[PDB]
Amino acid sequence: YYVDWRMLRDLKRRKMAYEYADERLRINSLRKNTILPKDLQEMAGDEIAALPRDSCPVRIRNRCVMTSRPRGVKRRWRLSRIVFRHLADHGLLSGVQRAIW
Amino acid sequence: NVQASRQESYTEDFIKKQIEEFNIGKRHLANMMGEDPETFAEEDIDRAIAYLFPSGLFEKRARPMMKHPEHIFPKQRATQWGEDGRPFHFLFYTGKQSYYSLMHDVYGKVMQLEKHRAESRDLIGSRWLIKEELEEMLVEKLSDEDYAQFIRLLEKLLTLPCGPAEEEFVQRFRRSVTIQSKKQLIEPVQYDEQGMAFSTSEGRRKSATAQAVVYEHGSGKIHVNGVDYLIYFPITQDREQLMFPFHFLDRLERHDVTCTVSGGGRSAQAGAIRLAMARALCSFVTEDEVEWMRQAGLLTPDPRIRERKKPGQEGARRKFTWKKR
Amino acid sequence: LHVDVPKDVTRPTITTSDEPDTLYKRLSILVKAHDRAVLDSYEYFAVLAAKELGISIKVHEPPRKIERFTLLKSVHIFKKHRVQYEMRTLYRCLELKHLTGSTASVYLEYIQRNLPEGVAMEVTKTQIQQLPEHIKEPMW
Amino acid sequence: KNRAARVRVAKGNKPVSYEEAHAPHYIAHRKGWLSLHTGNLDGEDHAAERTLEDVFLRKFMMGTFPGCLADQIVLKRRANQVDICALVLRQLPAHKFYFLVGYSETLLSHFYKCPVRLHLQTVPSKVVYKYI
Amino acid sequence: PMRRKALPPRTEKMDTDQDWPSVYPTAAPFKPSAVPLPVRMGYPVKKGVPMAKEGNLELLKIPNFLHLTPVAIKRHCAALKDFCTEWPAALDSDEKCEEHFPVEIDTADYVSSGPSIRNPKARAVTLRVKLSSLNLDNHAKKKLIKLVGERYCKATDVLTITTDRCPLKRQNYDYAVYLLTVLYHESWKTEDWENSK
Amino acid sequence: NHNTYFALMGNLRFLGLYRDEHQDFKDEQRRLKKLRGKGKPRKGEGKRA
Amino acid sequence: TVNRDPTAAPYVFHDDPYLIPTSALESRSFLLAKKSGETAAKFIINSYPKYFQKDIAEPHIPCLMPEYFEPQIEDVSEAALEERIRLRKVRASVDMFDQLLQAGTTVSLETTNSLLDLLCYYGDQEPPADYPGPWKAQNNAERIFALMPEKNARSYCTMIRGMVKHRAYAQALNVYTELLNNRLSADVYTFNALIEAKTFILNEKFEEKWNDILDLLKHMVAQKVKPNLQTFNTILKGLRKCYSLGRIPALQILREMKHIGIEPSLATYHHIIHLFYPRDLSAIKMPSLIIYDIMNELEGRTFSPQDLDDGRFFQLAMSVCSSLRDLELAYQVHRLLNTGDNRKLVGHDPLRKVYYSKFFSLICSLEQIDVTLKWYKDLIPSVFLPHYQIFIGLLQALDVANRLELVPQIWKDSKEYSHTFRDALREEVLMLMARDKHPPELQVAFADCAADIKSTYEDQSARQPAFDWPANPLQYIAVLFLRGGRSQEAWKMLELFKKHKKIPRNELLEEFMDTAKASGSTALAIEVVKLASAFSLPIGESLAQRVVMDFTVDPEQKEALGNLTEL
Amino acid sequence: SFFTKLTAEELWKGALAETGAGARKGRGKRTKKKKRKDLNRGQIIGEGRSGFLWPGLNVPLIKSGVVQNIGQRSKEEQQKVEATMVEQREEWDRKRKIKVKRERGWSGNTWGGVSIGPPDPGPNGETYEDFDTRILEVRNVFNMTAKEGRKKSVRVLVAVGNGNGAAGFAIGKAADRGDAFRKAKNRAIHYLHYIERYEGHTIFHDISLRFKRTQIRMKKQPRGYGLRCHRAIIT
RNA sequence: UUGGCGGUACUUUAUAUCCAUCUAGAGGAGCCUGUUCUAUAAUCGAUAAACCCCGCUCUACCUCACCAUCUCUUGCUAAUUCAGCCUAUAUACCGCCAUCUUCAGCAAACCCUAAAAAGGUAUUAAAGUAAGCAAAAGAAUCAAACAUAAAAACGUUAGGUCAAGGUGUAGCCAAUGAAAUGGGAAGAAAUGGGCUACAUUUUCUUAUAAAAGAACAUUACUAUACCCUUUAUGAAACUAAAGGACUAAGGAGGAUUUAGU
Ligand SMILES: [K+]
Ligand SMILES: [K+]
Ligand SMILES: [Mg+2]
Ligand SMILES: [Mg+2]
Ligand SMILES: [Mg+2]
Ligand SMILES: [Mg+2]
Ligand SMILES: [Mg+2]
Ligand SMILES: [Mg+2]
Ligand SMILES: [Mg+2]
Ligand SMILES: [Mg+2]
Ligand SMILES: [Mg+2]
Ligand SMILES: [Mg+2]
Ligand SMILES: [Mg+2]
Ligand SMILES: [Mg+2]
Ligand SMILES: [Mg+2]
Ligand SMILES: [Mg+2]
Ligand SMILES: [Mg+2]
Ligand SMILES: [Mg+2]
Ligand SMILES: [Mg+2]
Ligand SMILES: [Mg+2]
């Protein structure tokens, strides 16, 4: 069991983007240039569109791995601000201290 | 019916055992560090403990310690009565037997001097011991009124004719005052390959840092970062700041300075050089002049530096607008 | 042990090869840690260890780095009230010189195996070698 | 008022350990860090994975030694080695601890694919820093 | 069912002339029953002393150096001397090294804590050679300096080739050596279009 | 892998090698709730037909 | 660089006072509990492998991955049979082999031999394992051997070895006869099994039996097969039966071992010692001297595992030293154990504690007390936790060296090793302390030791409903209290003689009276008379008269004393 | 998820709502209030629903000289162990409700006339087991404060006596009733009057007095007359 | 008698603060943004001081919790007449905070009173005493000080948050659960905050903030709007940036009000 159904959908989006990464790279390369005929580029523009929507890598959201919070996350630890503060304020993060200056 | 851990008062047998364990500890710590147990000292102990138990805690009271039990264990007032229950001191029932025993002695001294019957400044540059120091001498806690009364009685003793016994007595309650030397430390005078004399000093203003190299003999040629000072400092106010050290001592056109200022802006770099030149120029002026410079602000580093911004407000002191109601 | 002592302790087999050895002109070891005292103790162990094997060593302290970030103190609203956190990194650089490749492997293993917890190393070997045989002689 | 990791005052009958007594602002001042790895140092990677592993390792030891932990565990990472240092009360028989050590080491070494060792220091009872 | 009783600490049986390296052969956590020292740690309470070693989490939180003592390190390095090889005496100076070994190859290792020993930065290699060390005619040196662009530093006369494109360090190292050979051989070659400069 | 952690620890709780205070708390709240007659209905037999 | 820590338990055991093994039983129990926890984890990992499959370790660690032992090839082919054979499944492989024969599909002779190896080696039984065997005439191994269309030397050889392993000596020899008739050639391993067969079989005449085993050796040269170490070790192990007649044959073998170039291992000497120094040796008057020559031969040599009896050598060598009462030889044997990494061949749990127990007991008997205490601190507890008899030997050594001041210290050590409530040990400690008089300081120290041993009796009495205070401890504890400024306690202990109905000894009774005279307390003197009357001891009347002259008795005391005198 | 699970201490703290604001201000007519329970009370380390048997943890490591191996209880055997645990669990619960009767006072809902035991031992182990304490009044007075508004304290009047002529009384005030009992009980032992009894059963003579506005008229009576007085005077 | 109050007096007083003093702003214009209102088939929460660029260090799909339509019924897990629920109650709570507050008190154990509802000080001293928490000290801003941060008890506002997560009670279980597709509009209307400009201490250009040459009121100053092109990210431009034109309003802002030592 994952934290919630929103984290479950994100996990599937992350696993389907990994499968279609090479494919979406090869097809999209044919479009990001000015050396190939525009007819081929217009056709590659539709082959990429036909791929499943969950393959698109901009539909991935970074969520707290422990609470599935969509916003407030710190990318280095993958935790929300609320969860990070609980581990930091208890001495459980190695080298994290309060900032007094 | 209050249930908290009571004071673990330390008996003499307890502290005695704590001193035997420490004495056996030193022999082990010496054996670990490969040193001779006989010569191993308190300073070596602190060095050994710091290596074997590295701690980076900012507060040093919280770091590992293997100290002699006397330093760590607070020395406590012992039992004030015997097995039969009779207090050892006749002033026991006052509650401040040691404060009142001392006030008994000084009042008896005062009476003999007054009955029995020169300059009183036998000691100068001394202060009366502070309340915290007195409390330690008596091994008990005093109030502010208790301290004030003790001093008034001691002052009365000095007023009266005092034999050498009284002077030694009041001496025990006088702590030597150390008047900090607020005088400049003159720089050395090195010599170049050519043989000319020169002194060097650093200066810091805001984030700028400078390293001046004043020469004893010159025509007033100042070069900043290998450039002239009129070119490097196109602003008049910055050049005026470089003039202040020499103009003050009427030494314009008599020294040749080579500066190296990195960091900060135009004004902070001129100010940093000003201090660096004033500190280097000390080696070539009389001590009366060096004091003249200090009292004109030329030798004091400026502590004013940019303040940090605080979260929840626009600036270091600027606060977000209090929204209308 | 007072009376019971090993007689002929077994020692690892070190066989000298016929391949020439690497020659390191310099070998910079940058240790990093959150604690200054740990670096002081490790610096003492590393300098003492180098001196005992004949290696030439120097030490300096690169400037420390402090990374600060701000977070929201409350779980909901109260924007203006924040909590700030920092991570402090301290550095000690051990610059070794004129090391053969065998001396640099045994030394690095010995000091890397004894690297305390919370300490990260960054070895930067600088090898010196002859010119390529093709480059030595111009050929058209 | 700040509530984070602060054991509050009652009537002077609440035992607190040294770790519990000190609020977050004393971290790096009076009390150190329970976990020591290289993942939060400057220019270092895999902080998220070290932090997630620690969270699990603490819940695992609490359940595997229920009521037998005198204080929070200390995690020490050196190379790929993991070292767990736990103060444990002397409640269980001695042979039971030998079982749980062999079990918890093997299970956590085959779960994270690293050598994991357990270090247990037994105390007669919880150590009380102060009564608050 | 009587409770089990703990034995007295083994520090009591430890002599003051023991072989301490044997007590702590390798890095271990602080064991109050094995460290024969009355060490105390902890910010003391008012009218209190720092906490004792037994049951001290703060002492356990320290990365101690008990296994690494001046007596151990000297005994350790004595064994490790057999491994070391002697630096050639002739190369007593940095300038002497540049004469016989003009090529400097920079490689970096990284040591961190975790299950994976992989760091992306370990593949990068940097070759540094001085053009004076290379046998270059006046024509060749001008051609070498124009091709390399900013890799050449006029002040130091050092050519810097940094290769990280290949996955492994042995490939990146071999590539930089290749780049030097092509640049050197190409510099000597004279092309007809060069006469139009 | 939230599935591996939840499944692995659940299996250990049933083998007696792990104790889940959170689960034991919930398991007893269900027991008491069922006695009170507030237990989960069977699927397809809910209040609405 | 590092050496053994003398004040620490073995590294296996957890380094905590609560978790250190006090006794030898706990040592094995603590390790068995550890092995049990390791097996509980491996069971879970191998039973729920899906949770232990994510690999985050670079480089990859193969030994930290879940194991799979069940065949995953479903199709019935020679390849599938080969998999089962590789996994060592015996019954499943037989079923798939028979199914392959039922279909008639070709099976390679090499593959058919891999099946016989598995069946012959495990004797038709599934491999032993833990989770939640004579040769059978009608078995899969023999059946499959007959079904084999084409036979090779290896096939016969596998049968000969498996039979001998599973105690089928008679059949194995018959199988070998077939191999000779087919004109095939055996290997060294098969010749070693055949030699093991002739020896185990009981032959009426040794001379015939010996000539038979030699015939196997002669056929090893006809077939150009060279012997190995195991071959000679097998012959010597068989010779240990005939101690009297195996001496000359045994030495000849070792000379032939060197000429061939095979190097005798620790096991090879273990067998020669057994054959020359029998444990049940009546003729102890003039023992053999070979043990001295062997140790000289092996002085300074380092040995590695090369046989299955290498561990046995050291335990046997120390035993022979104790029998001969030669402590110089015991040092040579221990000195050999310390060279290189010979320590690894001391033995397992049964033989590790016999070697050191035998060693330390010899030291205490034949070594100076000063050195004896050096060995004591080194070996115990770091090497072995001794049984109580070891301490009785140590205490007796202290008595022979006139150093009884250390007896209290030996007692404190004994309590750590679970001898606190040992009756035999407690009786020895008190006996030696109170056997003779001592200076005042020593008597006071002994009195404190006597008090501690009293608490053990007292606490044991309280816990147990039925408890008996042995008579001798009562006398020793009472005497020590009188001699060591604890006379008041000794008067209370006088009552315990009546509570437990133990007969006070004549010496003890008069000792109490002597102390009473110095004290001058007539009351205390009469107390002794009371106890004498209880047990109707004849001396009690004489003691009562002695009190009359020793002290002035008040008229009230006269009436009270007279009543006791009448009683 | 396994990572959203909290400890028992945190689960009970929240569910009980003891530290909540409402309880502190007494804004609920407490009834049917959750009762805390320890769930680790009867759980043995090594015992699971699956019924596995772990040598060295929940079963003997060695049995009759045989080194045990892992095993599991049968479905019937496990249903028995599970049943036995339920019986122990219920047994504890019934004992929780079981209580020991204490005699009431003048009325069932009043504290007047209730024995609260002897005073506590003195400074040098001076026990007062021969003294009995009785309550004469418990009042909930109020002091208005700016911080707390109406603030409540418990004022207790107690009397003590050894039944042999020595008796005393004191008032104890506190915010908690239990504390007011301790303060008054130990204070009254410091104010012991000695009362003269004629022949050990009555006063020496009639006694009429006025204390403030209270009037008392006592009369000496013969044996067997009994105490015919105000209930406080009887106490 | 205690507390609260007094358009009852008499003394202290606030330190960027109540009045006075000082500087730059808000209030007017154009935009960006929040809220309210209107309004939509179409979230939720915050919403005097202590909400209003607030949860968001962030909404084209996703995010998403909303609306419409279509679809699934053991439906994430080892097992479970179970899974799941952003369904109600922050007036059941934990967790984490706001506020008086850098305010000086809080709580507990004792002792005293011609009774005590409470109160308990006098220093040339008259009933108060000995300890905890806060403050102080200490540590941080890598000499030193100062300063700044941090710290700040117990209570007050049933203050905020069941939508970070968890959880008590009640409710849904072919639906209040799960998944897919397409939508989630609009003002220009009030108001909060911010940005930019209104210019000469200015405008543009080169330099570099030195200096110089031009511009300087009808379009000079002057839009980060609308519109038109190009580029960046993406599958999708509805987004952002860079140019181009096009010009509007703006001529230093009433009552009043914010911040700074
Ligand atoms: K709350
Ligand atoms: K607006
Ligand atoms: Mg949920
Ligand atoms: Mg996104
Ligand atoms: Mg500003
Ligand atoms: Mg009633
Ligand atoms: Mg103001
Ligand atoms: Mg406006
Ligand atoms: Mg609300
Ligand atoms: Mg959307
Ligand atoms: Mg949608
Ligand atoms: Mg919903
Ligand atoms: Mg609320
Ligand atoms: Mg403070
Ligand atoms: Mg509310
Ligand atoms: Mg919820
Ligand atoms: Mg809600
Ligand atoms: Mg300008
Ligand atoms: Mg214009
Ligand atoms: Mg595009």
Side-chain angles (χ1 to χ4, degrees), chain G residues 289-321:
Chain G
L289 305 181
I290 286 185
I291 183 60
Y292 302 115
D293 301 359
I294 287 169
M295 287 308 314
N296 298 329
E297 175 59 36
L298 311 182
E299 191 172 3
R301 277 169 61 183
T302 307
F303 299 84
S304 295
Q306 292 192 332
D307 200 54
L308 298 188
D309 290 344
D310 291 348
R312 296 181 180 276
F313 168 80
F314 281 111
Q315 177 276 334
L316 177 64
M318 196 49 72
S319 302
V320 168
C321 298

Coordinates of all heavy atoms in Angstrom, one line a residue, chain G residues 289-321:
Chain G
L289 N 58.8 -42.9 23.5 CA 59.4 -41.6 23.4 C 59.1 -40.9 22.0 O 59.7 -39.9 21.7 CB 60.9 -41.7 23.6 CG 61.4 -42.3 24.9 CD1 62.9 -42.3 25.0 CD2 60.7 -41.6 26.1
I290 N 58.2 -41.5 21.2 CA 58.0 -41.0 19.9 C 57.4 -39.6 19.9 O 57.7 -38.8 19.0 CB 57.1 -42.0 19.0 CG1 57.9 -43.2 18.6 CG2 56.5 -41.2 17.8 CD1 57.2 -44.2 17.7
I291 N 56.6 -39.3 20.9 CA 56.0 -38.0 21.0 C 57.1 -36.9 21.0 O 56.9 -35.8 20.4 CB 55.1 -37.9 22.2 CG1 54.3 -36.5 22.2 CG2 55.8 -38.0 23.5 CD1 53.5 -36.3 21.0
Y292 N 58.2 -37.1 21.6 CA 59.3 -36.1 21.7 C 59.9 -35.9 20.3 O 60.1 -34.8 19.9 CB 60.3 -36.5 22.7 CG 59.8 -36.7 24.1 CD1 59.8 -38.0 24.7 CD2 59.3 -35.7 24.8 CE1 59.4 -38.2 25.9 CE2 58.9 -35.8 26.1 CZ 58.9 -37.1 26.6 OH 58.4 -37.3 27.9
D293 N 60.0 -37.0 19.5 CA 60.6 -36.9 18.2 C 59.7 -36.2 17.2 O 60.1 -35.3 16.4 CB 61.0 -38.2 17.6 CG 62.0 -39.0 18.5 OD1 62.4 -38.4 19.5 OD2 62.4 -40.1 18.2
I294 N 58.4 -36.5 17.4 CA 57.4 -35.8 16.5 C 57.4 -34.3 16.7 O 57.4 -33.6 15.7 CB 56.0 -36.4 16.7 CG1 55.9 -37.8 16.2 CG2 54.9 -35.5 16.1 CD1 54.7 -38.6 16.6
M295 N 57.4 -33.9 17.9 CA 57.3 -32.4 18.2 C 58.6 -31.7 17.7 O 58.5 -30.6 17.2 CB 57.1 -32.2 19.7 CG 55.7 -32.5 20.2 SD 54.4 -31.7 19.3 CE 55.0 -30.0 19.1
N296 N 59.7 -32.4 17.8 CA 61.0 -31.9 17.2 C 60.8 -31.8 15.7 O 61.3 -30.8 15.1 CB 62.2 -32.7 17.6 CG 62.4 -32.8 19.1 OD1 62.1 -31.8 19.8 ND2 62.9 -33.9 19.6
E297 N 60.2 -32.8 15.1 CA 60.1 -32.8 13.6 C 59.2 -31.6 13.2 O 59.5 -31.0 12.2 CB 59.5 -34.1 13.1 CG 59.2 -34.2 11.7 CD 60.4 -33.9 10.8 OE1 61.5 -34.3 11.2 OE2 60.3 -33.3 9.7
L298 N 58.1 -31.3 13.9 CA 57.1 -30.3 13.5 C 57.4 -29.0 14.1 O 56.6 -28.0 14.0 CB 55.7 -30.8 14.0 CG 55.3 -32.2 13.6 CD1 53.9 -32.5 14.0 CD2 55.5 -32.4 12.1
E299 N 58.6 -28.8 14.8 CA 58.9 -27.5 15.5 C 59.0 -26.4 14.4 O 59.9 -26.5 13.5 CB 60.2 -27.7 16.3 CG 60.5 -26.5 17.2 CD 61.6 -26.8 18.1 OE1 62.3 -27.8 18.0 OE2 61.9 -25.9 19.0
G300 N 58.2 -25.4 14.6 CA 58.2 -24.2 13.7 C 57.5 -24.4 12.4 O 57.4 -23.4 11.7
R301 N 57.0 -25.5 12.1 CA 56.3 -25.7 10.8 C 54.8 -25.2 10.9 O 54.2 -25.2 12.0 CB 56.2 -27.2 10.4 CG 57.5 -27.7 9.7 CD 57.5 -29.2 9.6 NE 56.4 -29.7 8.8 CZ 56.1 -31.0 8.6 NH1 56.9 -31.9 9.1 NH2 55.0 -31.3 7.9
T302 N 54.3 -24.7 9.8 CA 52.9 -24.2 9.7 C 52.1 -25.2 8.9 O 52.6 -25.7 7.9 CB 52.9 -22.8 9.1 OG1 53.8 -22.0 9.8 CG2 51.4 -22.3 9.2
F303 N 50.9 -25.5 9.4 CA 50.1 -26.5 8.7 C 48.7 -25.9 8.3 O 48.3 -24.9 8.9 CB 49.8 -27.7 9.7 CG 51.0 -28.4 10.1 CD1 51.8 -27.9 11.2 CD2 51.4 -29.5 9.5 CE1 53.0 -28.6 11.6 CE2 52.6 -30.2 9.9 CZ 53.3 -29.7 10.9
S304 N 48.1 -26.5 7.3 CA 46.9 -26.0 6.7 C 45.9 -27.2 6.7 O 46.4 -28.4 6.7 CB 47.1 -25.5 5.3 OG 47.9 -24.3 5.3
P305 N 44.6 -27.0 6.6 CA 43.7 -28.1 6.5 C 43.9 -28.9 5.2 O 43.8 -28.4 4.1 CB 42.3 -27.4 6.5 CG 42.6 -26.0 6.0 CD 43.9 -25.7 6.6
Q306 N 44.3 -30.2 5.4 CA 44.5 -31.1 4.3 C 43.9 -32.5 4.6 O 44.1 -33.4 3.8 CB 46.0 -31.3 4.0 CG 46.7 -30.0 3.5 CD 48.1 -30.3 2.9 OE1 48.7 -31.2 3.4 NE2 48.5 -29.5 2.0
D307 N 43.2 -32.7 5.7 CA 42.5 -33.9 6.0 C 41.4 -33.6 7.0 O 41.2 -32.4 7.4 CB 43.5 -34.9 6.7 CG 43.0 -36.3 6.6 OD1 42.7 -36.8 5.5 OD2 43.0 -37.0 7.6
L308 N 40.6 -34.6 7.3 CA 39.5 -34.4 8.2 C 39.8 -34.7 9.7 O 38.9 -34.6 10.5 CB 38.3 -35.3 7.7 CG 37.8 -35.1 6.3 CD1 36.5 -35.9 6.0 CD2 37.5 -33.6 6.1
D309 N 41.0 -35.1 10.0 CA 41.4 -35.4 11.4 C 42.5 -34.5 11.8 O 43.2 -34.7 12.9 CB 41.8 -36.8 11.5 CG 40.7 -37.8 11.4 OD1 39.5 -37.4 11.5 OD2 40.9 -39.0 11.2
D310 N 42.7 -33.3 11.1 CA 43.8 -32.4 11.5 C 43.5 -31.8 12.9 O 44.4 -31.6 13.7 CB 44.0 -31.3 10.5 CG 44.6 -31.9 9.2 OD1 45.1 -33.0 9.2 OD2 44.6 -31.1 8.2
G311 N 42.2 -31.5 13.2 CA 41.9 -30.9 14.4 C 42.2 -31.8 15.6 O 42.5 -31.3 16.7
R312 N 42.1 -33.1 15.4 CA 42.2 -34.0 16.5 C 43.6 -34.1 17.1 O 43.8 -34.4 18.2 CB 41.8 -35.4 16.0 CG 40.4 -35.6 15.6 CD 40.1 -37.0 15.2 NE 38.7 -37.2 14.8 CZ 37.7 -37.4 15.7 NH1 37.9 -37.5 17.0 NH2 36.4 -37.6 15.2
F313 N 44.6 -33.7 16.3 CA 46.0 -33.9 16.7 C 46.3 -33.1 18.0 O 46.9 -33.7 18.9 CB 47.0 -33.4 15.6 CG 48.4 -33.3 16.1 CD1 49.2 -34.4 16.1 CD2 48.9 -32.1 16.4 CE1 50.5 -34.3 16.6 CE2 50.2 -32.0 16.9 CZ 51.0 -33.1 16.9
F314 N 46.0 -31.9 18.1 CA 46.4 -31.1 19.2 C 45.8 -31.6 20.5 O 46.5 -31.7 21.5 CB 46.1 -29.6 19.0 CG 47.0 -28.9 18.1 CD1 46.6 -28.5 16.8 CD2 48.3 -28.6 18.4 CE1 47.5 -27.8 16.0 CE2 49.2 -28.0 17.6 CZ 48.8 -27.6 16.4
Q315 N 44.5 -31.9 20.5 CA 43.9 -32.4 21.7 C 44.5 -33.7 22.2 O 44.7 -33.9 23.4 CB 42.4 -32.6 21.5 CG 41.6 -33.2 22.7 CD 41.7 -34.7 22.7 OE1 41.9 -35.4 21.7 NE2 41.6 -35.3 23.9
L316 N 44.9 -34.5 21.2 CA 45.6 -35.8 21.6 C 47.0 -35.6 22.1 O 47.4 -36.3 23.0 CB 45.6 -36.7 20.4 CG 46.3 -38.1 20.6 CD1 45.6 -38.9 21.7 CD2 46.4 -38.8 19.3
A317 N 47.7 -34.6 21.5 CA 49.1 -34.3 22.0 C 49.1 -33.9 23.4 O 50.0 -34.3 24.2 CB 49.7 -33.3 21.0
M318 N 48.2 -32.9 23.8 CA 48.2 -32.5 25.1 C 47.8 -33.6 26.1 O 48.4 -33.7 27.2 CB 47.2 -31.3 25.3 CG 47.3 -30.5 26.5 SD 49.0 -29.9 26.9 CE 49.2 -28.7 25.6
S319 N 46.9 -34.5 25.7 CA 46.5 -35.6 26.6 C 47.8 -36.4 26.9 O 48.0 -36.9 28.0 CB 45.4 -36.4 25.9 OG 44.3 -35.6 25.6
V320 N 48.6 -36.7 25.8 CA 49.8 -37.5 26.0 C 50.8 -36.8 27.0 O 51.5 -37.5 27.7 CB 50.4 -37.9 24.7 CG1 51.8 -38.5 24.9 CG2 49.5 -38.9 23.9
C321 N 50.8 -35.5 26.9 CA 51.7 -34.7 27.8 C 51.2 -34.9 29.3 O 52.1 -35.0 30.2 CB 51.7 -33.3 27.4 SG 52.4 -33.0 25.7

